Design a protein around this ligand. Sequence first.
Ligand SMILES: Nc1nc2c(ncn2[C@@H]2O[C@H](COP(=O)(O)O)[C@@H](O)[C@H]2O)c(=O)[nH]1
Ligand SMILES: Nc1nc2c(ncn2[C@@H]2O[C@H](COP(=O)(O)O)[C@@H](O)[C@H]2O)c(=O)[nH]1
Lengths: 796, 795
Amino acid sequence: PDYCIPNFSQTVNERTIIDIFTICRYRSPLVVFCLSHNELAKKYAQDVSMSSGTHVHIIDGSVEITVSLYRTFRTIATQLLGRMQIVVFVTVDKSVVSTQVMKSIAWAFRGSFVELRNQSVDSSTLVSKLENLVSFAPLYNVPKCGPDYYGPTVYSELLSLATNARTHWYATIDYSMFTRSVLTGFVAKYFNEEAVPIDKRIVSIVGYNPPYVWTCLRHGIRPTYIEKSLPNPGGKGPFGLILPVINELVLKVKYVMHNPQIKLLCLDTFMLSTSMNILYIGAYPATHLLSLQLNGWTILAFDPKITSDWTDAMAKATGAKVIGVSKEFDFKSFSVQANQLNMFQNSKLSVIDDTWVETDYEKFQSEKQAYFEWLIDRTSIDVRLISMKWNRSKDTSVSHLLALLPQPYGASIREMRAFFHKKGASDIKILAAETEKYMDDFTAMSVSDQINTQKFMHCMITTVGDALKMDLDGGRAVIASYSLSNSSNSKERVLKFLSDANKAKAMVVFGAPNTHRLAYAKKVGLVLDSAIKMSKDLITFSNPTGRRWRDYGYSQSELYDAGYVEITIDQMVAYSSDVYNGVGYFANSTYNDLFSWYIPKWYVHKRMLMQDIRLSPAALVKCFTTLIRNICYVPHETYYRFRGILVDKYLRSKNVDPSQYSIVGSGSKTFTVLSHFEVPHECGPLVFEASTDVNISGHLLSLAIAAHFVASPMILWAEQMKYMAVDRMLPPNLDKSLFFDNKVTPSGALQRWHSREEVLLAAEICESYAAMMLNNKHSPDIIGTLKSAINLVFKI
Amino acid sequence: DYCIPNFSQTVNERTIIDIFTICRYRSPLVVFCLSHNELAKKYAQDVSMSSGTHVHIIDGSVEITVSLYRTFRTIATQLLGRMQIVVFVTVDKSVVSTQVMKSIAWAFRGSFVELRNQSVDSSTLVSKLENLVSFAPLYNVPKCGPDYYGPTVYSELLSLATNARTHWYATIDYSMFTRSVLTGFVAKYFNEEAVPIDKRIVSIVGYNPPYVWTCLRHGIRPTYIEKSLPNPGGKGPFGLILPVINELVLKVKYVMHNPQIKLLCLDTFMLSTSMNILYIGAYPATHLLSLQLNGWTILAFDPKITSDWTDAMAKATGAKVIGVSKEFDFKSFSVQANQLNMFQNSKLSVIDDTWVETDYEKFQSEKQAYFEWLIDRTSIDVRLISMKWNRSKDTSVSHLLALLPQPYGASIREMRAFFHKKGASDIKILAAETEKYMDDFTAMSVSDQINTQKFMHCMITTVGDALKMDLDGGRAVIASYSLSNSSNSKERVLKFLSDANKAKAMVVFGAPNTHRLAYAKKVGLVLDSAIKMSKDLITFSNPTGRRWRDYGYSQSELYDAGYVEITIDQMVAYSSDVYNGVGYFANSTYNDLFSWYIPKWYVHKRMLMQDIRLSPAALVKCFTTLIRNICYVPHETYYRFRGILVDKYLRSKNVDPSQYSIVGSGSKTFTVLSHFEVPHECGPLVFEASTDVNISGHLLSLAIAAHFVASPMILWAEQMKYMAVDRMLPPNLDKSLFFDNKVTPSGALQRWHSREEVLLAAEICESYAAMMLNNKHSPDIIGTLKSAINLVFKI
Ligand SMILES: Nc1nc2c(ncn2[C@@H]2O[C@H](COP(=O)(O)O)[C@@H](O)[C@H]2O)c(=O)[nH]1
Ligand SMILES: Nc1nc2c(ncn2[C@@H]2O[C@H](COP(=O)(O)O)[C@@H](O)[C@H]2O)c(=O)[nH]1
């Protein structure tokens, strides 16, 4: 035993399990770089491999593209835990493989994607981004699974002596930002695929979570928050939002956001959430809007600096109906028919006012105030909210004033924002002495304390109510995790709520800590009791800052019995690749991997049974097995011999007579049947006809290992495996290259994968397979919940 | 911290443990030579798609020098990635020879396959190509050697009858590889020094059985030296007639798989006693084909000997063989008969392997009379005669030195009688006592039987203290535990080694490395229940339960005595063209605790010019890359970190920061603005203004590698000092061997670093190791290397 190979007894201990968890933080080493100049590709490929050992591939066109993709990415799928950079240069034209297809492939393998096939050989962009490969390897400054990034990691700082060649790195926070972004993008993809009308692209966020305002507007979605109780902001007015009171954050380390013109994005993404029609006064330039998707929005912009080119550019970039007007806004006409407001009749309207003067400012504002006080009251228009900049040294009385707030990304600015609303205060006297004293307290707070005051404006798009009783009709979109997962929320009452949402054809995306993965991480000693405790399903969390909170853990089998399928964040962004406008990430996160995300069973069966590369588990089914085989001296053919030996032991334990089968143990045949026999199973008996070949599913086995360390696509894969029990046709509306990893019959159809017996047999040896691979340091709980979920998928 | 690069949260003691573990996998390379490029491309695809093996093809579309340079710079960074690497060479033998590609492969600890003149459908070619896909990430060709004869049988990995398992004794197998490589290095020395064949002898200090086989695989004859010999307890003068036994420890069943091991065990011993052999009954003796016996003469008697057999035996072994197709005449009794005239006034030994089914015990008596006669010649110096012994009745025997059992004979009841002149004059061997002696022998385990070869090998063993031996003539000696153990003090050992380097002898010395062993204990890899240490006094223990004392040595102590550390990897690659030993499959933590050393005089004579066989290329980058990946160190950031360390050091020595501008790139560490000096043990380091300084990166990387495995640092330092100026390429050697060195326009090898750029790197070396290993480095290891480099750059 100790002196034999393959060897699991000396090589796989609790320490090796720890190291595998650690290696999982590095499971995204891929960069996909598209350019149109092959000699330039060969030069930097050799440069980055000679200097840092980056594995490089070039898809040059000397081989057909489908074959080129299949060979390259079947190789790469096994190296993803090798802790070394991988770079695929793509030099074929866009007519051979399109930008959107290559982006789907790259993101399905957790890679960064760079598209530069239109640039000539000596572009500044092209040479610079190619030289970055050599400078940064094994790192790269293009995010994985997303073109954009705005966190504190600044890659140029790694090359500067002034910074000591260092930069910030908040893997957990950044991956949490990437997750909120992807969940939003998946809802965006769901809205397009279900042809949901534009003015109904609304998503309910259960529990307040500020970044969803920006992510939703980046995708043309309006967010609504749902909260159990209403925290009294402590200010004046009917909702307490006139000079609200503050309570401070805890000592930490600071996470800084580097969005350009962040102060304008914060107010404008919020206002755009309130109405599909916007009156924007002072809009020039509004370059910050160019990065949003505003399909269905109508913006009536007023600024003397508006040109005809500005209106055309803004509409082209955002997709919104923009109507630029190069006149100063006339605040002293009190008519609807003036200022072109006629278009907004019998519809809702919100107003954003960014106008300011250097002459007669303080009474210029009361002209605007008197006009906005008049404007909020029309019955031919449903004016929802008016944003105005406020700075007064003289006391004023204001009507319909709902809120008077500081600016979260305002720093030392003495300027405030006033919000007008129908349900606001009938009258209130704003004494300029207390706003000055208020702005002195605000400007003396830490930037972190200032940014958290955005909860005051965001509560103007918040609803009070129990999320477990909301209306689910209309395919309503809901994203829900902590605030739903546990507020002492009964696990029964949550599971029933999710069960009803699936039956109502609703889109409630749900996330929760994975009970059995967390347990396994604690047992092997990766997560310590001082950081995370657990008693059955109840979890007590803590982050390194000192905050603690309770949460309920769920498992894949509990949610499948409630009509919910686990899908990974990787699969979600790849599936949504042609709609995603979010951020990417640079590092994976152990803490984020403890959580699993789920989607309703009805939407899986409707849209997801035909697995192309976007929903492939290829980035998980090969790299864990390959890593273990390298540590444990498991030759390639020896691995397949082991699968036969485990089948032989299993069949003997079910009192099958060995004379009825012949163990082969190959890559194509597990065993041959001699006499017909049957094996008891909960999904009905497994029937093996005599003189047949049986080849059990390796995807199931290797995903069982993978489910110990990261979120598993096991249940989504199982549903696609059942679908692929017979030959299928390739969908005609999808690009053929998305199927390079789907094997094809001689007639050009999609070949069947496995029979039902071949799948469920793998489920039965699955426990002993993990016990073998992990030296009995596996988790029977994780195997059992998966096993129990495979059985429900194949239920008879 | 919340910053990258990050060493504080990524490198703790557990991370150090893993690096030590990963070192067991530091030989993932296979170099496969074949002439068919589309076949290489087909299997390069099959092995990478199925197992993730990284594949390279040297296909001749690019000039060979830069193809090697590009491919092996890439590979050198990946040797610790725990993934197999395969390089296919499809260019012709005239573009890069077999012996040059073998040196390259072994210099990178790879296995080597040469099949370049085989058809695209050759049985062996397609078989060994399919073995790549079937065995990956393993391969069945040994690393750093063509042959393997241990218990690991790769075919069992594919057999369901075996449960797809096989034996795996990494520590013993690597110790066998080490013995073999040391022997080969002594053989390469014998070639370079033009040592006459009849004087190719090596003295193994301390009895060490496998050296008999490794020496005869290289045309060398072994001699053991023991301080004292326990008398075997038997009869005759030297007590070798039926010696008594004391048996071994319960445990590991390591069974060597040599074909006809019974004959190799005797024949390699008999071949150690004389260059001229009389082989009676020599057919077929296929076991001899594996040996290198150039300078031997074998006269072989067997009625089945053909002239083809005499040809294939001489072509394989290189020996001069006379093939007599006739029965030996044991009654002739003449020095001028049986063609024996050719041995007059020569040394001779006799291997007798004859038998008969009828007339046997009479046939033995006829043989015995001829041998008792033949041992007494004055015309020829008959040194030893071995005969099959199986007698049913008492006999008187003359000149009988030994009557031994067959160590690999298992249950066979026949024995071996050895005739020598210094043997018993008359002695009666009662057949009733041998019968019961063979009763006890055949009842022992196979390991107890095999160990009786000590009785044979004490006939090529001298008694005496090894520190008093004569070192004249460039004598070759292999010495390890039986020198460095606590019965002799270090001072008396170091003086012996110092007097041997002064005397221009080739004493190859090995010892455990004090600081590497202490570092493996401090971080928690080696526990006190296995190895304990009191300063430099080490108490070992292996899983069988045996315990022993030994003394640790350091690189500085031995450079003080005129000895240079050289790794096993460098020895086998330096000796590649003569090497005929075994390879290995896995590296061993236990063996990595040891260091081997050669005399400084020979380093200076033959090893200052660094071609790929002597380079540290397979160690100067794989640790740095592994750490850069763990700790998020970008490529250019790694070079700015280097300049920042020089900044912190120069300011610590009260250099004014205005005198230099830190650049921190791969080409320039910093630029000098004003002339300044920094004090140093070897004389001040002089930096003049308007100069670019680029310190030695290899020294920094090697200091890291010296924490985990043996270091070529001191050999590298001697080659570095020799490279302060340009040096002319040797016109002897193939120029592909220098693919990794920069060659000047003129055709000579370009200077590497000035004296200032080396010693500056050695001074920031401690802080570099503190940075890379999160202050969990070994100051002892840094200091012993720093003091050895200082001694190398002495003025
Ligand atoms: N594209 C794709 N093919 C699969 C998947 N699962 C199985 N297959 C196909 O079915 C074959 C047999 O499945 P396996 O034995 O690997 O579970 C695979 O080699 C592959 O061709 C999958 O999840 N995605
Ligand atoms: N071939 C070879 N070149 C070396 C070695 N050490 C330094 N160099 C040369 O020295 C220069 C870089 O110095 P380093 O920073 O690598 O010590 C390069 O020109 C490199 O080729 C060595 O051990 N072998």
